[PDB]
Design a binder for this molecule. Structure first.
Ligand SMILES: Nc1ncnc2[nH]cnc12
Ligand SMILES: Nc1ncnc2[nH]cnc12
Ligand SMILES: Nc1ncnc2[nH]cnc12
Ligand SMILES: Nc1ccnc(=O)[nH]1
Ligand SMILES: Nc1ccnc(=O)[nH]1
Lengths: 520, 520, 105, 105
């Protein structure tokens, strides 16, 4: 971008526009970027520490920061989310426009015990988008540091670091190291700005609806089937019990025994825990009772895991130990905070098609019955994909992620990001940004030793992201009224999704998207 | 319409189409029309009867029936109403298309004690629209007999009758008598059909919103005014009480005493009654405590009367004796039915601008204060229009009326129909319909006496009304979520706005339109 | 200019054959059971109760005036025209309102 | 693929709904608002026709020996398969699948 100390390089574009089948969100925020690692790349790992084998790692931390808008509230105000979710069966991102501007680099000089800041007019900030995905993709891990939900909040840019192969806390020859400078980047003084655009690949619309039928209630409740099933293996009060083979035809009084076309979704059972502590076992079972996967001798909690309904009817007090997305309140501490400082999602709407998360998928025969041997069956707790299965993916939330990069593998299977959202082969590129090192005064005599004395600085500016979203309109012939997300009409001390008397914006609950209904 | 015994003259067009700024409702129903008054026009009145002076009348009943779609649920399904009200700040009718067809005239012959019906193929039904408004306008009095809310219900056509001037139970020379035949009408046999279209005049969009500010809270809560008001007429702890004139400037701590630009709406006070009977007086006060107007020595209850808020904050248990629209449940008896068989509307949203219906409008000076004479004031219970007043009209309901004819008078004042809806100078014309008399066998010898022997018959067919409605879209920058009409998510024995196990459609509550919000 | 009388009145606009779908509070007590007891009883608009039917319209404005008879014997024995008159007050000066608001005689 | 067998279709042949239109019996002489509940008893009859085009995958087999083929039974009996009996009742005496020709894997 071209021109002045004295001249803004961008305006403030923060707004929504609804246009029939499209909605265009624009959001702009003011950021702050410190100097990280003192302009150094450090090797990092779990060495010392005392970490268990399931926590070892090797990687590198970087002098760079990055931009992250991978959360719905970076784009949708609460009211817009409401508009979205109460009138559409779905939506997807189509295109994006990104803007960095009004940059201002500042130097900090400290004497005492006391601190002066001034402008350093001839200083630059550097930027690039990793558009060929040459860097480890660190979005889609649900990190904090995204654009804040509230447009008036200033935010600090997160620091980029990444991991590679590790054997315990050591590295392997196959471990990759990346230097960000080695990339062409744009260098901006206070006059300049950065822009780029991006188009999203074609992706299925996110399902913003619950079903109003369930897999097991698809039949016509008036008519028999023409199909028969073995109903009894003994009579039938003719005294007493005699071996028999008796067959019945499908009938509305026996909807549990009717032949059908479809199976419910996959299942990886999880441990059921109550919100009233008195119901639970008196031990610490989370790691030990947890559903985990085992990768190169390292255990990892499956969380949130397969899309599964959180609880069956009437049991809203239970939840899978690690099968629901959980947001912290703005009072929550980092670790071992209490139940009332968190917000647990509920994915109950999918119980029309998806197994409940804390129960068996079902039952299977396990032997050959005969006069000598009694029929046996077993419980199935982990069921992979079977032809004929159908299921609903995890819901998204106003404060959850939007997308993730599908790993570059030979094989995926339904690569919808398990934490919720859109899987993208070629996702929105990472956007990296750094303050250029500015040497302090060198000595009078040459020295070859790497320069280690710098003027202390940081930068600030605005960033703007515009996304176009396509909508799937609702076409429902449903006669009665829908469940609709609504704010509460009763009176209170504070308004939901507002700032308080100290100016702290709060999000008092998660909001999903499943209010409108479809048939199956 | 042209053609066959064997040939339908219309199809079934029942559907909604949403199109950005327009929504087009089509509804079609199946009707039944008996022979009324045996093809006679009768003079009718309150003579004998024992009626009080406030109930006397004179008029005429007619052999004709009529069509009435003047209720929102004749056009909007519950789900559509929901769509309407949760996304628009307003709406109005623009144009209409009406269709009578598939007519079938039948003769009834009874011997015994037992009854045979057959087709009378060569019989006609007659129809016309009173498009020059030459007939007494009987729509907009909230009569029953409109198209039913539920498309599968068959309905009987109401009978047309009208009133004229009466002096007690007698007539005056100025009294008008109308013969409907004297009008050209279309004569339809089983093959034929009737159609006409109509355009609505320009009218203000109905306000489907509550305000989120009130008249008395329009100021900037941070800043003083530059304006002053007399604050004290005595000091001010300098002992003891001394005459003084002390002036203060408008201030956020004194929002009740700040000069302002606007006044709240008009007021005609009504008697406050509680839903818990124990609160009320032990008498029958409705006529005797009622707000009434007096017209030519005849009293009439003002009901619903001036648009006024039903109750102030926290007092949802009170309601004006005759200032709220009240719908009957499908269990309600015609007279003296209990509280739980009715549904009382609530117009509480308008308390931002409109006086509460059971309180004074305010207080007025009534004398000249002096050292000798103490300042007096009086309560104002009935306040007409004052320059600077602003107000909100009564809300409409999914089951309330749509429009009424503005009377043809020299003078109206804000002629919005007090029961709610659109006032129309030139409203949708009345549509009249009758089975043509079919003589029974005459005698063999002439007789001049009016024929009085007829073949018994009635007719049935379909009717279709299509209305185009223009929408006022919402443009709100409100950050937090709105109150939205929503059905209840908790489980129950029946679904709202559905048929039961005997196939009776029920409407379990009124729904207004005021959910979205505006600023004032 | 309206050179016509109406042949209907504001309070007689309804269809005299059909009920309304609208209800109004009819009684605040029953109803012979023996005594008087607090109650809330609602009735629907009906041709037998045209004085209690909901309606859309109100009659015109009103500024009441003193009724006087053409047969003198009916009237009060005093001179009440200025003193019983409907007057407006303008800058401390009274003026008889005459003929005043359009009202039926 | 529908587990009971057949073709799964995103956008399958639409449901086709049909009903006899209500035909009121004689109404009363005086208006009543209550649900109309008296009807002339009726029913209907007619023909319906469905035509479907099916594409075939022809067999291209180099298999030298003869195939298993669905065949009716040559031995004599009291009734013919897939026929009506002496009371005119059509019967289907067995299921027939479709897997007779063979492929290599
Ligand atoms: N959300 C998603 N993104 C990309 N591919 C998918 N395949 C199934 N769901 C998907
Ligand atoms: N609803 C309405 N119809 C016609 N004129 C009006 N003037 C004010 N409100 C009106
Ligand atoms: N029968 C079938 N119909 C539709 N999709 C299928 N995919 C695999 N088998 C199928
Ligand atoms: N990836 C998938 C496999 C099967 N079905 C899907 O919808 N998606
Ligand atoms: N009729 C009216 C008079 C004054 N203001 C209005 O909005 N309408």
């Amino acid at each position: 971008g071209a021109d002045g100390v004295g001249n803004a390089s961008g305006n403030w574009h923060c707004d929504s526009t609804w246009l029939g089948d499209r909605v265009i969100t624009t959001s702009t925020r003011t950021w702050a970027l410190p100097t990280y690692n003192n302009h150094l790349y450090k090797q990092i790992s779990s060495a010392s520490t005392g970490a268990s084998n399931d926590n070892h790692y090797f990687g590198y931390s970087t002098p760079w920061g990055y931009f992250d808008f991978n959360r719905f509230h970076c784009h949708f105000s609460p009211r817009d989310w409401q508009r979205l979710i109460n009138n559409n069966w779905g939506f997807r991102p189509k295109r994006l426009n990104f803007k960095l501007f009004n940059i201002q680099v500042k130097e900090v000089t400290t004497n005492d015990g006391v601190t002066t800041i001034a402008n350093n007019l001839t200083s630059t900030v550097q930027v690039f988008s990793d558009s060929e995905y040459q860097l480890p993709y660190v979005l889609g891990s649900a990190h904090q540091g995204c654009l804040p939900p509230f447009p008036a909040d200033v935010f600090m840019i997160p620091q980029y670091g990444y991991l590679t192969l590790n054997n315990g806390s050591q590295a392997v020859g196959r471990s990759s190291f990346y230097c960000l400078e080695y990339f062409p980047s744009q260098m901006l003084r206070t006059g300049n700005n950065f822009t780029f655009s991006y188009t999203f690949e074609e992706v299925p619309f996110h399902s913003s609806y619950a079903h109003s039928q369930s897999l097991d209630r698809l039949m016509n409740p008036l008519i028999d089937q023409y199909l028969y099933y073995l109903n009894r293996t003994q009579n039938q009060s003719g005294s007493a019990q005699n071996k028999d083979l008796l067959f019945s035809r499908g009938s509305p009084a026996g909807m549990s025994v009717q032949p059908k076309n479809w199976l419910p979704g996959p299942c990886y059972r999880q441990q059921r825990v109550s919100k009233t502590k008195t119901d639970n076992n008196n031990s610490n079972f989370t790691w030990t009772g947890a559903s985990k996967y085992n990768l190169n001798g390292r255990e990892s909690i499956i969380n949130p895991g397969t899309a599964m309904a959180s609880h069956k009817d009437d049991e809203d007090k239970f939840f899978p130990m690690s099968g629901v997305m959980i947001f912290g309140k703005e009072s929550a501490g980092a670790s071992n905070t209490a139940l009332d400082n968190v917000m647990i999602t509920d994915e109950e709407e999918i119980k029309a098609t998806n197994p409940v998360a804390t129960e068996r998928f079902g039952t299977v025969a396990v032997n050959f019955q005969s006069s000598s041997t009694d029929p046996a069956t077993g419980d199935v707790h982990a069921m992979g994909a079977l032809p004929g299965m159908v299921w609903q993916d995890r819901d998204v939330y106003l404060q959850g992620p939007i997308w993730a990069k599908i790993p570059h593998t030979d094989g995926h299977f339904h690569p919808s990001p398990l934490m919720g959202g859109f899987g993208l082969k070629n996702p929105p590129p990472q956007i990296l940004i750094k303050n250029t090192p500015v040497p302090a005064n060198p000595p009078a005599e040459f020295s070859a030793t790497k320069f280690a004395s710098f003027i202390t600085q940081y930068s600030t500016g605005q960033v703007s992201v515009e996304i176009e979203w396509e909508l799937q309109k609702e076409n429902s012939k449903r006669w009665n009224p829908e469940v609709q997300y609504t704010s509460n009409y009763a009176k209170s001390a504070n308004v939901d999704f507002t700032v308080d008397n100290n100016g702290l914006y709060t999000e008092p609950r998660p909001i999903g998207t499943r209010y409108l209904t479809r048939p199956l």
